[PDB]
Amino acid sequence: PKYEASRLSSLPTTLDPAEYDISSETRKAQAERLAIRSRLKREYQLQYYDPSRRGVIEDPALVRWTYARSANIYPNFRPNTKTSLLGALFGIGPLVFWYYVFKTDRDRKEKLIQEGKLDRTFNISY
Amino acid sequence: YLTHQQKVLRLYKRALRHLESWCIHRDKYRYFACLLRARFDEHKNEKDMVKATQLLREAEEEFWHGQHPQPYIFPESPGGTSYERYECYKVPEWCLDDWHPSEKAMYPDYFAKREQWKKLRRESWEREVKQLQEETPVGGPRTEALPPARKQGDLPPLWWHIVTRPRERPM
Amino acid sequence: DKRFLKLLRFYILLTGIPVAIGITLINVFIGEAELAEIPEGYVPEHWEYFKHPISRWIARTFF
Amino acid sequence: RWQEDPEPEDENLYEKNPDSHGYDKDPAVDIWNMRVVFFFGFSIVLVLGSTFVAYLPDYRMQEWARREAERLVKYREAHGLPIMESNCFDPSKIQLPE
Amino acid sequence: MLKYIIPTIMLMPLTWLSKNNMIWVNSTAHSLLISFTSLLLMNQFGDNSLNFSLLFFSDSLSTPLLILTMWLLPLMLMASQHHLSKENLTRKKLFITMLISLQLFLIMTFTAMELILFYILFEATLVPTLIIITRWGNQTERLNAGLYFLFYTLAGSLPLLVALIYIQNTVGSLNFLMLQYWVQPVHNSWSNVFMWLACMMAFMVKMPLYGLHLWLPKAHVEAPIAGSMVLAAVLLKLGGYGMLRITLILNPMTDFMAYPFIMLSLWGMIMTSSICLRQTDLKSLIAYSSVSHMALVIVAILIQTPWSYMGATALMIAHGLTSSMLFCLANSNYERIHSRTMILARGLQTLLPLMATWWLLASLTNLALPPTINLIGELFVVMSTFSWSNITIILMGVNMVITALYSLYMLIMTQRGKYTYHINNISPSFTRENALMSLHILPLLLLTLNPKIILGPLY
Amino acid sequence: PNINKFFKYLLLFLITMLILVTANNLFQLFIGWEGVGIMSFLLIGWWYGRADANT
Amino acid sequence: SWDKDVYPEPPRRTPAPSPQTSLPNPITYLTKAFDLLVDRPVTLVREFIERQHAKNKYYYYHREFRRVPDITECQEKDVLCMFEAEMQWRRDYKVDQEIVNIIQERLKACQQREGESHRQNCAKELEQFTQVVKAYQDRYHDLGAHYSARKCLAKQKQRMLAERKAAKEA
Amino acid sequence: QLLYITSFVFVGYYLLKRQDYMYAVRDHDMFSYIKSHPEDFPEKDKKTYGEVFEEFHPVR
Amino acid sequence: VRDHWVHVLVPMGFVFGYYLDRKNDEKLTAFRNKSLLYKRELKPNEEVTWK
Ligand SMILES: CCCCCCCCCCCCO[C@@H]1O[C@H](CO)[C@@H](O[C@H]2O[C@H](CO)[C@@H](O)[C@H](O)[C@H]2O)[C@H](O)[C@H]1O
Ligand SMILES: CCCCCCCCCCCCO[C@@H]1O[C@H](CO)[C@@H](O[C@H]2O[C@H](CO)[C@@H](O)[C@H](O)[C@H]2O)[C@H](O)[C@H]1O
Ligand SMILES: CCCCCCCCCCCCO[C@@H]1O[C@H](CO)[C@@H](O[C@H]2O[C@H](CO)[C@@H](O)[C@H](O)[C@H]2O)[C@H](O)[C@H]1O
Ligand SMILES: CCCCCCCCCCCCO[C@@H]1O[C@H](CO)[C@@H](O[C@H]2O[C@H](CO)[C@@H](O)[C@H](O)[C@H]2O)[C@H](O)[C@H]1O
Ligand SMILES: CCCCCCCCCCCCO[C@@H]1O[C@H](CO)[C@@H](O[C@H]2O[C@H](CO)[C@@H](O)[C@H](O)[C@H]2O)[C@H](O)[C@H]1O
């Protein structure tokens, strides 16, 4: 019985067939990843351990993340068949849906009240 | 980043801990622990590394099928019932710098000794930076490892936040 | 944090105790008005339509 | 590039004045600032203001309405009258169309 | 109202003639005294409003808004005096002058008897507000935020001016007492549809209605703390207060004209509440929370029932204090770490124990824990919209769940967990900061003991 | 170290439950209803440095 | 302390103690202790306070509002007459809210008092509650937040027109 | 500074005088025209709200 | 005192404002003791019913 990955349940690393077939080209890439991580670690630790520092060690990665998650969207937005259809589907559609739900409910209720078939015997708070 | 040997030894430790979770009773666990150790021993001297990798891959598939869905976890290990329990009590040492003078006055001996550590940190820092400069290749460090102090009177570079970290049971 | 709470406590009680004592004395040694029909030909002041002495004083003084 | 001053370092008010209330660098001004805020804010507005609200003379006539309702319910039930009528206004004063 | 207008004006000579080092002490003390005297507006009657003169009147709606307005001024001076410490003396006094002039316009706005007078003062508040944001905001984007704020308002308020003048030509008066008696029903026609929109859109943009709300998260992220406090606490309520008044003369057309705006609000509050769960900037999160809370007020005003009008009034007061608190709490973190990013500084309950209590209390009012006036207002609206249509309870109920999630998410992320290792400048809470927090929450919780005074004319 | 606060939260827990049990109207009952829920939140997340407790 | 006709109460019927046990009743002794330890000292303090009050007797009055012409007798747009008619209507509206509250209070007290026999023994209170709620609903329901005497009169005339129409076709 | 105040007040006084006179003239013209043309400003027949029919619009 | 004379500005603004509010009332007495609800006879020493 093979593992079937899903969006919310990743494939275990020990069952990943690419985990074992490791080439010299793949070891070279892993070494370069550890060099970037080590270079950033050193840059951080030099400020983190500095006895004269008091404040926040600004992290450009955090600044880039908060900037991307807001200000950078509209400049890189293109009106096309995808964003327009998603823009319409989840922008106007719910308002029209709820309009008909509530409008239909209220027309039915108002027609019964006028005909005197809605029980409002003790309804004096509104 | 894990060698073949490291992968095998990690599976052995992991498989035994899930076996212990199934067996529960010590005499029963001892019996099946020896049977499992025998299975690793039969292929101990495999030389054809292609076969060794296939044995490791098949073993991992076997572990996944037979793992305990609720294995035992040491209380303070990640996922344990006491993991991170005392983090709320861990306060960094720099917080003592903001104590009111009357608060510091209650521990005259502690804060006198604290000033000695701060003096030691201050006088050691420039040499720590220099040692890292002269020992680091041009393109920056390639690993996270740090060196010892080389001369006498020197301290290992970047020692403060390791030496002065909060106690595991700080209150 | 301890100092702020002491200061907050002190300034609340600074007027809080005089007011609490002042209300107790007023309720004991003055008391509330008692309901009565308007005597014929008498026009009460607007502050006389209220029961509690502090309420009457508020209406009389400010309102 | 241009001639611009460097960014100053943020100053911790507690360094010069460990007793600082955080209002002013001048200790005398700092203490007075704390006193007006605490006295006029808490002693006056909140304590006396809360007391003033507690004794508002029958705010919006709720108590008078209850007394008036009791008077009407007493008189109406004594005389065998309906406690309340559907008509707010006397029909004899109304001229319907057509 | 002259007993409040003149002493408010006198705050300006007081600030300019004070000793250099006593501008904050003097302006704070005397604006607290003005706030004290504002409790005399509680002389309200069961039938008639408090009609002072030909220009100004007070009733149970404007009175609570007046008291909130005058209370906020000393709180704003407390919140501002720290980040303005380096500012030179003359510019400090100009800042205080803008706050004072804002209060003067606001108290006149809420008591103006004539609607065109209300319009001019309603518009006048833009000028100082825009100056505060663009001149004393911190970042480059305050200039854009100033423009969006200015032109969103005027795009709606200019049509309101035409409608108001048109009404006076047709009716002969814009005095609100006169309109109470000379109001005539609004018949169906395309002319009346656009008269309705002209009468309402300006107030919708200020609330803000969902779809016209995009200016508000901008304004908050760029404003100084005092700007955020007055924006959230009072300036949003100019729309609600305006709608509560002008709906008098729009019946029965509101019966069907309100439908699109009820749909935008009912669905809008769930969208904005959901958006709060993913916001990365603390000020922006609080800003989106306001849009969701005010969507309830729009619905309440538009369905026009006694319960909905009482709930709308309580919500406006309750949100005013809560949102002002939340901005002040977020600002006190900003003054230490100089970033609005919510995930930057974590586990602050370990470092600032008492400030974490204020964070807890503010969050609990934001999610409307009973019996806070935040809950009373929300509940009264939920009760009245249920009669309007039983299906609304599903949308109202879902929003309550999402509101709790994002309120506690904000509390958990910033106050709990592990502290950030490298942030080593979290100095102890100042007396000023603690007093500022308590001057929000204490009146808020005290109002629970006598809620009637914030329930409005329909009480 | 915060045993005093712990016992205060247990007492507040008990008070909101008694409000719930003795309430004669739904608004009063709702006060106790939500009170016990919020006290549950504060006591379940007692060890707040732990992510699982906050979750 | 209050008018018994407005807030009626049946005559209370208490059974006499009729023990069928040799054990003493702990409630009897706690009642004696409570009367001695709690009630008597409380009564003494109150009697001291009532003596002080008797030295400073003063009065307050229930405001009387003379009747003025109602909205039916006001010429269109005559604000001076409309204002007095409108304020009177608002005062009556507040009074009618409290009359409903009195009847609801009677109903709720009957339900608790009659215990498990409340469904039968509270019929008169239930009937009175039903009638006043109907009368109140006719007057004031559906007027909206911007209610007035004008809107109330318009609603009544709509109801009158419906009643006349049905009566004709009969 | 004194002459600034005095100059403003002096000119302001006369401008206010003209302002009030122009509004008095407007009222004088309007009332005379209404007298001259009674047929265009008939005295309105006023009914009470008991006699006037207004539709009721329920808010439910 | 030259130190504390600025502290009278706002309190005097309130007194002046209070006084002008009362002056405003003297211009709105067209119906004093003339409303159908409250109109009555004057007491022997009374000149006006309110001011
Ligand atoms: C806790 C401090 C709170 C400070 C704010 C309140 C300050 C004012 C407190 C009330 C002062 C006394 O309140 C006032 O006393 C007298 C009673 O003697 C009342 O006066 C009434 O009774 C007295 C008899 O005693 C007679 O003059 C007369 O029958 C009548 O005027 C007033 O109607 C009442 O309002
Ligand atoms: C929340 C607290 C607010 C604090 C406000 C602080 C400012 C207080 C301003 C005080 C103004 C007092 O103003 C003055 O008071 C006296 C009381 O002797 C009143 O005195 C009058 O009250 C009524 C008026 O019908 C009558 O009984 C009688 O004419 C007289 O007693 C005056 O009508 C009023 O002109
Ligand atoms: C007839 C029309 C003209 C009407 C003029 C009426 C007012 C005339 C005021 C004349 C005196 C003005 O006073 C002049 O300005 C201010 C306030 O005093 C003073 O200087 C000021 O500096 C700072 C504020 O900036 C403060 O310390 C303090 O307010 C004061 O010392 C000057 O040292 C003084 O020379
Ligand atoms: C519906 C009722 C309310 C409608 C109100 C609409 C009126 C216009 C409001 C905004 C006016 C701001 O005026 C102008 O707008 C544009 C974007 O819109 C701003 O420009 C900003 O967005 C544009 C477009 O992404 C970017 O190229 C630019 O880098 C950025 O600064 C200008 O810097 C500003 O000067
Ligand atoms: C009804 C109105 C209520 C308004 C309330 C306003 C509160 C204002 C608080 C003012 C704080 C006191 O302000 C300050 O007090 C002291 C003593 O009086 C003055 O005088 C001071 O001068 C010097 C200090 O340099 C010393 O001699 C001594 O410290 C003191 O005498 C200061 O010159 C004044 O700046």
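^ dodecyl-beta-D-maltoside complex. Residues 12 and 18 of chain I are 10 Å apart (CA to CA). Residues 2-51 of chain I form one domain.
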